[PDB]
Amino acid sequence: ALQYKGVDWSSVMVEERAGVRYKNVNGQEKPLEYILAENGVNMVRQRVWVNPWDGNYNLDYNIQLARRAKAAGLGLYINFHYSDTWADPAHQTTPAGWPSDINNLAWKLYNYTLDSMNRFADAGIQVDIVSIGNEITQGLLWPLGKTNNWYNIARLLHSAAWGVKDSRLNPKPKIMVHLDNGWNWDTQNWWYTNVLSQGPFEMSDFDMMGVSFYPFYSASATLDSLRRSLNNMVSRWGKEVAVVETNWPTSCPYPRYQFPADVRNVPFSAAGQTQYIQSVANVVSSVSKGVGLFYWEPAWIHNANLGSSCADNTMFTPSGQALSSLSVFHRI
Numbered sequence: 001a002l003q004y005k006g007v008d009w010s011s012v013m014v015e016e017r018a019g020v021r022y023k024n025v026n027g028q029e030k031p032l033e034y035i036l037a038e039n040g041v042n043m044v045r046q047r048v049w050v051n052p053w054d055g056n057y058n059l060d061y062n063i064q065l066a067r068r069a070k071a072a073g074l075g076l077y078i079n080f081h082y083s084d085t086w087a088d089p090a091h092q093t094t095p096a097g098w099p100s101d102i103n104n105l106a107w108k109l110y111n112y113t114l115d116s117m118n119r120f121a122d123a124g125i126q127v128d129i130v131s132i133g134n135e136i137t138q139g140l141l142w143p144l145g146k147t148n149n150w151y152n153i154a155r156l157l158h159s160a161a162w163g164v165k166d167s168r169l170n171p172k173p174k175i176m177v178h179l180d181n182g183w184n185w186d187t188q189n190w191w192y193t194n195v196l197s198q199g200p201f202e203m204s205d206f207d208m209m210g211v212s213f214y215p216f217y218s219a220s221a222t223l224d225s226l227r228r229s230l231n232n233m234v235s236r237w238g239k240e241v242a243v244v245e246t247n248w249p250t251s252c253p254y255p256r257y258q259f260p261a262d263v264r265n266v267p268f269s270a271a272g273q274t275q276y277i278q279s280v281a282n283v284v285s286s287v288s289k290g291v292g293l294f295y296w297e298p299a300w301i302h303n304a305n306l307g308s309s310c311a312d313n314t315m316f317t318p319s320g321q322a323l324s325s326l327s328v329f330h331r332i
């Protein structure tokens with residue numbers, strides 16, 4: 001069974017401010033962190049943005065969350081986007097103001113990460129996992145860290161990894177590199193190979209390799225491919241692995257892509273979510289060093305589709321009541 005099993009609950013306060021109230025399956029209202037712990041979750045993933053336009057997901061914002069997550073006995077997984085806004089394969093926007101030369105940008109990434117981690121340390125919050133970037137498959141901090149700029153990338157990650165290493169955090173969190181399409185091994189292989197062959201980013205600079213695994217972005221995302229990809233990654237670089245992002249809809253009237261053949265039998269419902277989340281967990285667990293699974297934004301009711309072509313990927317009622325499927329975190 002999985003060592004790390006949780007959800008990314010970053011939107012929680014934005015939702016509370018919007019008037020949302022959460023309840024477990026029985027209708028008992030309480031702060032989300034407790035409904036989560038109640039269902040077997042043992043860790044929350046939180047996204048961190050540099051200078052968000054409205055302050056959400058910034059350091060202060062994430063510290064209030066962490067403190068809360070800790071009170072409910074949940075572990076912490078800090079997810080740096082190293083951007084003012086959403087960072088993903090098609091968007092890695094360097095924070096306005098940051099440097100334009102690799103040495104200074106890297107230095108900045110270091111000071112930023114360093115100070116940020118020390119922010120939790122000084123606050124008495126323990127960070128368990130830290131991803132230096134978010135789905136950085138096409139690199140990060142563009143233009144400099146854009147893919148094929150392999151040198152700059154390994155250069156940037158090394159600095160970021162050390163911002164963590166040199167912080168007051170103790171124990172130090174596992175450093176993770178997060179790429180999307182974990183089912184695509186050629187991508188996982190191409191990326192790490194090119195980054196690790198540069199020299200600046202060393203094997204001892206990171207501990208985990210996290211991957212996003214979704215069913216609605218390509219019929220190619222088969223459980224088998226993820227299974228194979230993870231095994232290939234582990235056997236090749238010996239790092240702990242984990243699915244840091246995944247969803248399953250309870251409603252998907254207009255999918256943009258055909259779902260993988262292995263899950264076309266799984267229903268869009270609370271039952272189907274359980275089935276899917278459990279299958280994905282089995283894949284990760286089957287892999288030696290397969291250590292974690294995180295469902296992305298299960299409680300963002302005011303954004304149900306969660307940026308996908310599916311209508312609802314939440315594990316909550318439109319009114320905020322936890323669905324039965326949320327307790328799948330006990331079984332994994």
Ligand SMILES: *[C@@H]1O[C@H](CO)[C@@H](O)[C@H](O)[C@H]1NC(C)=O
Pocket residue numbers: 099104107108111
């Ligand atoms: C990083 O921090 C150091 C000392 O704290 C400072 O001298 C340096 O200018 C910073 N790097 C940049 C370019 O922000």
